[PDB]
Scaffold this active site. Sequence first.
Site, PDB file in Angstrom:
ATOM      1  N   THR A 186      21.965 -14.190   9.283  1.00 14.75           N
ATOM      2  CA  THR A 186      20.827 -14.648   8.498  1.00 14.75           C
ATOM      3  C   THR A 186      20.785 -13.966   7.136  1.00 14.75           C
ATOM      4  O   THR A 186      19.735 -13.552   6.657  1.00 14.75           O
ATOM      5  CB  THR A 186      19.500 -14.433   9.259  1.00 14.75           C
ATOM      6  OG1 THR A 186      18.392 -14.770   8.414  1.00 14.75           O
ATOM      7  CG2 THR A 186      19.370 -13.010   9.804  1.00 14.75           C
ATOM      8  N   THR A 187      21.943 -13.867   6.499  1.00 15.32           N
ATOM      9  CA  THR A 187      21.995 -13.231   5.199  1.00 15.32           C
ATOM     10  C   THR A 187      21.485 -14.161   4.106  1.00 15.32           C
ATOM     11  O   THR A 187      21.451 -15.381   4.254  1.00 15.32           O
ATOM     12  CB  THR A 187      23.415 -12.792   4.878  1.00 15.32           C
ATOM     13  OG1 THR A 187      23.421 -12.107   3.623  1.00 15.32           O
ATOM     14  CG2 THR A 187      24.339 -13.986   4.812  1.00 15.32           C
TER      15      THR A 187
ATOM     16  N   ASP B  50      22.795 -18.624   5.013  1.00 17.82           N
ATOM     17  CA  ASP B  50      23.495 -19.199   6.139  1.00 17.82           C
ATOM     18  C   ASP B  50      22.456 -19.934   6.970  1.00 17.82           C
ATOM     19  O   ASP B  50      21.259 -19.856   6.699  1.00 17.82           O
ATOM     20  CB  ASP B  50      24.214 -18.116   6.929  1.00 17.82           C
ATOM     21  CG  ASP B  50      23.370 -16.885   7.106  1.00 17.82           C
ATOM     22  OD1 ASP B  50      22.262 -16.862   6.549  1.00 17.82           O
ATOM     23  OD2 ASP B  50      23.811 -15.940   7.788  1.00 17.82           O
TER      24      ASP B  50
ATOM     25  N   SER C 167      19.708  -9.547   7.484  1.00 20.66           N
ATOM     26  CA  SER C 167      20.342  -8.637   8.433  1.00 20.66           C
ATOM     27  C   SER C 167      21.776  -8.352   8.027  1.00 20.66           C
ATOM     28  O   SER C 167      22.228  -7.207   8.099  1.00 20.66           O
ATOM     29  CB  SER C 167      20.318  -9.218   9.842  1.00 20.66           C
ATOM     30  OG  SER C 167      21.236 -10.287   9.950  1.00 20.66           O
TER      31      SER C 167
ATOM     32  N   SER D  52      25.027 -12.593  13.667  1.00 16.49           N
ATOM     33  CA  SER D  52      24.098 -13.607  13.192  1.00 16.49           C
ATOM     34  C   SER D  52      24.718 -14.467  12.105  1.00 16.49           C
ATOM     35  O   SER D  52      24.034 -14.877  11.161  1.00 16.49           O
ATOM     36  CB  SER D  52      22.812 -12.948  12.699  1.00 16.49           C
ATOM     37  OG  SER D  52      21.984 -12.600  13.793  1.00 16.49           O
TER      38      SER D  52
END
Lengths: 224, 211, 246, 193, 240, 227, 224, 236, 233
Positions: D1-2, D17, D128, D167
Amino acid sequence: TLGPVVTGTSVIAIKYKHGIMIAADRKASYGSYAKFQNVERIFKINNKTVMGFSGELADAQYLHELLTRKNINNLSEKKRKEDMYTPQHYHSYVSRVFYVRKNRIDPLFNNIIIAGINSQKYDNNDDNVLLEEYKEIHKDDLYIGFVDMHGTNFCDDYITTGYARYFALTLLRDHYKDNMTEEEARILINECLRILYFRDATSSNFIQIVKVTSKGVEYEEPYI
Amino acid sequence: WYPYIDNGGTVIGLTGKDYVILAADTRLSLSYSIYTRFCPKISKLTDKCIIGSSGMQSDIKTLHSLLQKKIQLFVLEHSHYPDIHVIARLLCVILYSRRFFPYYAFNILAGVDENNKGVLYNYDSVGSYCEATHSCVGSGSQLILPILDNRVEQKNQLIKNTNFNLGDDINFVKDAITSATERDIYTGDKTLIYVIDKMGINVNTLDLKQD
Amino acid sequence: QSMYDRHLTIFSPDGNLYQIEYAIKAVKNTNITSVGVKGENCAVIISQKKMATKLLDYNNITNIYNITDEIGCSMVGMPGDCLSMVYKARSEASEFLYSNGYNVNAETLCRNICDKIQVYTQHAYMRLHACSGMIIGIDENNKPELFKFDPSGFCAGYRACVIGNKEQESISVLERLLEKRKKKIQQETIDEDIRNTTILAIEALQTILAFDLKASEIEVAIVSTKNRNFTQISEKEIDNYLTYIA
Amino acid sequence: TTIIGIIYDNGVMLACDSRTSSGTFISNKCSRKINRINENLYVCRSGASAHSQKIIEIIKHYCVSMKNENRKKGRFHEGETIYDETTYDFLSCALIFGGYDKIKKQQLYAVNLNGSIIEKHDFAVSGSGSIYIQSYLQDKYKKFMTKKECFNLILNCVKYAMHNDNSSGGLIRIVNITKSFVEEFTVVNTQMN
Amino acid sequence: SRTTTFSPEGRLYQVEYALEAINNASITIGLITKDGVILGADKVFISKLIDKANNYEKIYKIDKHIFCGVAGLNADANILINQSRLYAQRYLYNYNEVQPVSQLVVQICDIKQSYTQYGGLRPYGVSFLIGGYDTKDGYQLYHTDPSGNYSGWFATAIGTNNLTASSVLKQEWKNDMTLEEGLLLALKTLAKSTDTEIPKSEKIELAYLTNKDGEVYQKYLTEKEIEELIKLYTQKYIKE
Amino acid sequence: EYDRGVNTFSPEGRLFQVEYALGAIKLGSTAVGICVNDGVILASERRISSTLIEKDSVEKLLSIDDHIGCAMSGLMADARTLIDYARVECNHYKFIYNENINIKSCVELISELALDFSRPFGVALLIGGVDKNGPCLWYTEPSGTNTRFSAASIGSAQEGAELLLQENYKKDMTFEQAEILALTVLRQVMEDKLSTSNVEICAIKKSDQTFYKYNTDDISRIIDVLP
Amino acid sequence: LTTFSPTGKLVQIEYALNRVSSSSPALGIRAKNGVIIATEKKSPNELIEENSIFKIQQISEHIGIVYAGMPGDFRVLLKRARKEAIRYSLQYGSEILVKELVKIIASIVQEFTQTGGVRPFGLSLLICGVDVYGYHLYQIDPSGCYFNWMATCVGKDYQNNMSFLEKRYNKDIEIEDAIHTAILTLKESYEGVLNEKNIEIGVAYDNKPFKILTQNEIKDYLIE
Amino acid sequence: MYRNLYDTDNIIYSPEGRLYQVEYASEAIKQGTCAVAIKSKDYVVVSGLKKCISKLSFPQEKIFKIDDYIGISMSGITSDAKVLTKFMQNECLSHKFLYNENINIESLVRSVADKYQKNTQKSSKRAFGVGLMIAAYHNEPCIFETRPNGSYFEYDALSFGARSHASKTYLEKNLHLFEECSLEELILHCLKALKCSLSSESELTISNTALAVVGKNHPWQEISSLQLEEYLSKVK
Amino acid sequence: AGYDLSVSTFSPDGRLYQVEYIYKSINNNNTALCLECKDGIICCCINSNMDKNKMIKKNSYNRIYHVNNNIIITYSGFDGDARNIIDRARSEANTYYYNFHTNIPLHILVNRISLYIHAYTLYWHMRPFAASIIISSFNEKDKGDIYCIEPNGACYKYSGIVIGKNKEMFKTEIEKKDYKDINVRDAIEDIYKFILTSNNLQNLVNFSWICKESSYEFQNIHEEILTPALNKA
């Protein structure tokens, strides 16, 4: 809030003959690392007084906006040059904000240092909100106050907040003299923050030095 | 987050015929490091009644200014300076006004009301005022109170030093506070020996052991 | 004599609310008219740009207020009551998004405005809002919608309507202007509604106001498909449409 | 989840993403980490996706109710983000605000957990997977760049932030912002090798 | 003026007009028998297009053992019935037993009394014959006014032409009255009050309690009163 | 004629609803209080015309506290409400501050309750006490004017007793000096005889600082001196 | 504050009844297999689209309503009517009964008479619909009372308009036969002889959901 | 239709454009006693004349005290003047408690004049008919005054309703008070205003004229009951 | 028949009486003035109340207020009721500064002040305001703009406007000279010439100009620039 998620480093306030010297780095650490390295902490609150931080930087906006607003309200009723809010008023008001928060459980973790000139014998009856020689003050018209997150408040001749209280204040309690020159004050902080570069885990360069003299609120940016 | 801290300090009270002696120390110590060596812990209210305290400064500057508000509101509504008996009952309800969240600051009320009548009121942090001829409050509470206990009340078979003049008794409080700085940590250095005689108060200072 | 029209919530012997009736006369006394007309996949509002009866900047005085980016509306009557009605509409249309996600419909906006208007009628809380307006705007059905509301509760809706001081001398003209396009030629829809409806709209205003209708004293807005923005038509295009009468 | 926000010489870009994992499981694959606000500013949030959708709703309600208060074609940019900070008077969520402005040319600045004092930022990045590319961004990012330079820079940035992260998203989204408001949602699907 | 103000005579104005407003309403008859209390009614006929077979708005139901015959403003009557049904049920929810009517009229006259004392609102133009059965003192029949001064009774004839219909019950009523004899007794006073000799049967409605240890509380149909109307023809318990 | 509103003014700069109650206080029983250098002595009538009354339930000299006594006039049903309020705040003052309240601080609060802007209280009092600084006697009105009086009179016959005190008050008068003086003014304006039941004097001495009601036995020795 | 009068009758209510005595005529007639309603839609011009301005609205899938007074009040009472059709439908999963619904709206209208500073409703309702206990057609009075009618009119000049129903109505009429006796009570009653798709007619449609008859559908019955 | 409709309500306006209910309050202060204040270069003296209602009565107070350097002198009705005194006392005392500096004079009167404003638009509450007279000294001794409508005027001398016209004329030709730095000449100049503006054949100043001074090293010192009759109440 | 009593009563003619009387109330009070210039927005305020007091300080009765450093506000009418609108104006700026961290623009403040004045007109118990407000500013890029707020809303943008006791007099004097492109330093001398036409040689006219390229912020009257008044030409 709860927990100092975005902390700050420590500032150093020292008074001398020409004015008030303050210094702070631009590192805003996210706990274990340097997330932001170009933030400002020395905040201008008036044309004669400023204030610094330490602690959570996020719990400073709830105090910066609640303070710069009072300056515009006071500026709108400036019917005389003596009606400007003296630093004694701002420091006593900030302590009241922390004391009412202390009655509840949320304390807004900060260790605000308020410095400024507590006099009106130097003509500044015209304010330039949105942007020659110095003078000599009698050391009693220079107010430098400290405010703890618990609401502890006082005023002295040299204040150092946060983690530099155990480092800066020690070197500064015996090296401080009365009526120090301008080059003496900056060389005192430069040799002082150097100690705070090899020992404090959360500190950096970009010492945003800000001086409050009898002519304005200047800004400088060395790098040691 | 614990909202109760102790800045440390002490206040010593003594009496006699027409005099009360209140003395303190100005070390506003933080958690473990001394921050400022000058922060007065005694503030005058009237011309014949002062107040000393020793808790956290958050509940001291507020409590001393709140008392100055309710005492200045009373003088301009009655045109008569209040005595100590009325100011003692005044702090009894202010401290009880916050029973769920008590003021972490014990206090001392000294002064003279009648022609001589040196009275001294001391109490805990909740509001149970009790008159006393001598008392100590603060970080050096357990260290100075037995010393003063050997001067007013007696245990000796020969009741020694019956007389008690203001001259010798002033040096006695300086002797007790000096005996506190050596054995206690939080006892400060700059002391303010406030003496309330019949005409007024004094600001007799003394600088002790910077340690 | 002291008749029964003092308060606003008191009926008359014949049964007429005279505080409402006098409020409609307040709109007819402001001598400011406006025409609204909906055609095929479009609808327009024609203002008048006149002070509600020197050095006044004429670009500021107007009678067109966008409630949202999709629903625009006009206002007439007293200038004080019309300004507060827009704020009681902008704070309502935007409230529909926060409470229902979708954008507010044009027909739901007028009915929600009339609900607050009816509340001030039965209660003697405040004075009536002496105003009127034409709420314009397309819906999700890709159809244009027009709605007019009086100072009392009304969600009539018209394909062509006139608001202002000349509503008693315009129905005989708007019916003919609408008949000049419905039962006439009616060839197709080449998405040139602006050259078909607005031209047959400004012509309706000239038949109402006997002046020469200066382009610097009139401003229109379109909410047609392919645009969907309640755009105020520029000055150069207004003066260009005025010469099309010849 | 960047989430990565890189500034241009004239405009700005955003990248995110699409994974939104729910306890080592992907329940909403190919979602929208980025969100639209207007024709000149976007908001891409990350962190806790619980209270995330409410803050995006309140911001969208306070933007429409503020843009119509001026005129029809003028919002503001800094004003909207400081309002997002005041809505944190908790809901733990890191946000990124970026977009074109009528006063300054472009503007991009983050909003951390509780304080939005990150103005005049240049390479704002949060989430994250943001911990894995904070140094890679500090090296390949110069002062002024071009459109294709930043597009090729953030492509590997989200790729490297996904190559070593649990993630990691599926199809990535890249949103541009300019004066003319190009805003083409350039979606890339290739992954690292 | 308003109801808050008094009058120099000592009476009131709003509660005095309400006492007269119920005089222009249809009549209702109350009657306590030795088997159970019975009630009467008068359906005012605006036209012949009403249902006239399923409903009637002069006698309502308060509880399974308490019932009233309203007389007055039909609009304001529905509020007190909606207010008395709650008190008749809030007593059950608070004491797990039926509510005595003596403790119900006190609970309902106070809601009228509260309006003629403050608030600056108009009073309740309603007055009704409320009766029921209780284990404490058997069958009862109370009577409220728009002021709240309730009082027990044996027979009451409020509505229009009260003084004439009440006089009928001064002589024809007896201490011992059976259910069938009481119905015929209350049937004549309901008919002669409207200056007629026989009810059209597409008129007046009757109700009766007669607790058979379960409080049956049956109402009447348009066909059931035909037998009662026929019995009036043979045995005429005349005006007198 | 402007009488609808309660807070309306006058073109001559005057109030209206307050001035109506100014004449209402001139219908109650008469009373008189004298403030001497040694204390405060009060006096009043006892209209117990109907002998069926208990004669003790009706009183004109109630007590605000043990140190402050007062009189009553005007609406007796509203006078008890202000006295009950004064009995609260004066007692509430003793709970906060250990000393007794000052009359200057007590009459100012008894007057602020007559500033309900209901209706103004149609009652005038003669609050007296020996709180501090010797004895003081105050006289309040429904308008709120609190004027400290040395010797005043309130009641239906307050006009005659006004000029009598002006020709009889002396600063060097003791208790027994004014006690006869507190009855000679009552002997003038009285439709009866000064018996041992119609008069209900009471005084607050400076020594004990408390009030003591003069009972039937003690007043008989004072009403027979024949001034 | 609509107080009483010395004659023993509300004067504001009597004034409110005059407003419904001068509006468009509403007419409802029950049958043995449904209920019908009708309203003379006074079309002022061709600008008002018929699908926007209506006189027949729905409360649920089986309840129909008709308006007869103040057009501005044709929505506020509808909002609280639909709200009561939802509050009953939330607790009780079945449909709202007409007697349970009309007693609530009658209570809402009542509270606008006794409350101080309010105005009574300037309209007369006609609630109709299929129920599990047969069909119903109620009429709500601005005073607050309600009648269990069978066939009635509430608009302008109803003293003689009901005369058509007192002589041209039977207890057992089908819904299709009752349409022509209702149209006759509108066209042959007074002016408005050009009845060409200018009459709104709702029906219960023999226990099916409430159906608002279209203009071309009524045209089949408008030929007679 | 005029003269009696636009008179009793604080909401209606006259067709001419005058709020006649509030205008009565401005005249209501004229029925009170006189008062006068003199603003010197570093001192401010306030002379107030009390009113002995009866021989047995005592003169009711006129000059009050608010703070050490702030003291007012009402002129009008004692009902509303006492309420504004408590509002001004709780306001200035809160400023010395919330902060430590003294309260600004103009920032104080702005709160007091606002109190008149709040009691002017509501239909229930009437206007305070009282002419305040705030005399204080913070850095330059200034004298402020209010009216029923919100107003401030940094006056140099004033008068209040009894014989104001006879007193205003004396102060109009006496503008040398600014250079009368000697306090003795100031209090004699201020008392001369009342002596030349008292009623006909009345007692001049028989210890019934309240006097108060305030200045640089002077708090709100009420002039004692002995310093005025020795030489100040004996020069004329 | 006496329908102008309350504010919620509408006249049978259609007009709204009881609010039109306020215009006759501001027509008897002192005047204020402002105008556009190519260098700033010079303001003006004449206090024609000299014949009764003559004891007030020279520069005390000021009727020029500013919400912050770049927006001025003046009054015309009841000076007491205008204090309440300034309190609502400064609070509107401070509330906008908290929620948006920027100075409040002009076209969003005027629309919020006019709503506040208009909101008190609708009430049946609160009396309407009696003060006309002049709001102006001067942008750095764009030129100035003066908004005039009278009672019963009606926010109108102007270029020069006078309100007070001579609004039908000074209006004819402004249309003579095109003030849109002259200066501020010369218009101030022209303004003092107008006051002499319509009534003595007194310094009871206090006024400031927002911009003279003096950081484009609200200055004071600057007495030294006001004293060389052309008292004859």
